[PDB]
Amino acid sequence: TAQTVTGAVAAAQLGATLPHEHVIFGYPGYAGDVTLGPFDHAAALASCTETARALLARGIQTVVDATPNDCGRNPAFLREVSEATGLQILCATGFYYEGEGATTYFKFRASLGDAESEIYEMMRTEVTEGIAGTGIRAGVIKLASSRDAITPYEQLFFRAAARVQRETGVPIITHTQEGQQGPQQAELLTSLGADPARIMIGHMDGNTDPAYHRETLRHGVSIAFDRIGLQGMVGTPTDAERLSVLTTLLGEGYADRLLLSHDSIWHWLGRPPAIPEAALPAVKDWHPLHISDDILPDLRRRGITEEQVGQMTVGNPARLFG
């Protein structure tokens, strides 16, 4: 049973799923720019429902919204987008990595007490009871680490998460910064007793060395090439490079542990970002319709079977989030 923003749905009902996307997203601090960067709800609702309908048209029935608690997460809004289109959306519980999250609060709590237990309580409540007194439960726990290490701050969340996972069985999806720490996250979470069949190490497409992936897959966890379409930003590689590594892994029988997504942001919070035309190519295909329209057909063209595509897009998510 997967927990979505509109209630629990049987794993069989999940269908084709995009395991890591962002309906709305805001970098910490966006709320302080509310005067000139307010949230136009009607505009957002219209834009997001349109994208939701575009996904449903492509066979995608479920989206896992990976937005951390400190990056604009809004379950009520997600629920609104879901009830208006029929698109199933799971939301998360967790904080972003130390490098970009709103870290002051829990760094403070950690100095005056047991932040881990507090973080554990938050996650447990949001997963089993609800978020902000809305009854909307998180369907996944979101974890994130920095590029050079899983910082002590971040480890507070990893430890709390592993515990909620053991006692709830809820799935865990993560963020790896600039193609590193995938093996470490997997090692850390599994050593803490977390179920490797309910863990998805994200942004693994950020590294182009298959050895890095296999070394992460060794832990039994699933890995996600979830920034397909984002070619150039934040150090990411090109899709050509992503598919090269992905086909190699598929050729080594890893289909059952590979997932695909875009890490797209349907509607930004704060003032709309100014995209310099020099970065236009890098974000050209960075939208939720890219995998369906270009990627899957391309994989088939290069030899990937329909069974493997079904495995990555339906089989894997049904098991990981169902």
Does 276 help bind a copy of itself (rule: CB under 8 A)?
A: yes
Say if residues 145 and 185 touch (Cβ distance below 8 Å).
yes
The closest alpha carbon to 117, from 146, 87, 159, belongs to 159
* Beta-strand pair 92-93/88-90: unpaired
Does 163 help bind a copy of itself (rule: CB under 8 A)?
A: no
> Is 22 annotated among the ligand-binding residues?
yes
Burial (CB count within 10 angstroms: exposed 0-12, middle 13-18, buried 19+), residue 282: middle
Residues that bind Zn ion (CB under 5 A): 66, 175, 263
Min separation Cβ 282 and a copy of itself, Å: 12
Say which entry of Zn ion, a copy of itself, none residue 101 contacts (CB below 5 to 8 A, set by partner kind).
a copy of itself
Other Cβ atoms closer than 10 A to 83: 13
Selected from 40, 53, 86, 113, the binder of a copy of itself by CB under 8 A is 113
> Is 263 annotated among the ligand-binding residues?
yes
Which two three-digit tokens encode residue 113? 């007490």
> Is 41 annotated among the ligand-binding residues?
no
Does 253 help bind a copy of itself (rule: CB under 8 A)?
A: no
> Is 20 annotated among the ligand-binding residues?
yes
- Residue showing the smallest CB distance to Zn ion in the complex: 175
Q: With b meaning 16 or more CB within 10 Å and e meaning fewer, what string describes 212-251? A: bbeebbebebbbbbbbbbbbeeeebbebeebbebbeebbe
> Is 256 annotated among the ligand-binding residues?
no
- Choice between 131 and 173, CB closer to a copy of itself: 131
> Is 284 annotated among the ligand-binding residues?
no
Selected from 10, 34, 43, 46, the binder of a copy of itself by CB under 8 A is 34
Say if residues 218 and 185 touch (Cβ distance below 8 Å).
no
- Choice between 113 and 297, CB closer to a copy of itself: 113
Does 175 help bind a copy of itself (rule: CB under 8 A)?
A: no
Backbone angles phi, psi at 49, to 5 degrees: -65, -35
What is the spatial order of strands in the sheet that 16-25 belongs to?
88-90, 60-65, 16-25, 265-268
Site residues for a copy of itself per CB under 8 A: 26-36, 38, 68-70, 73, 95, 100-106, 108-109, 112-113, 118, 121-122, 125-126, 130-133, 270-271, 273-276
Binding residues for Zn(2+): 20, 22, 142, 175, 203, 263
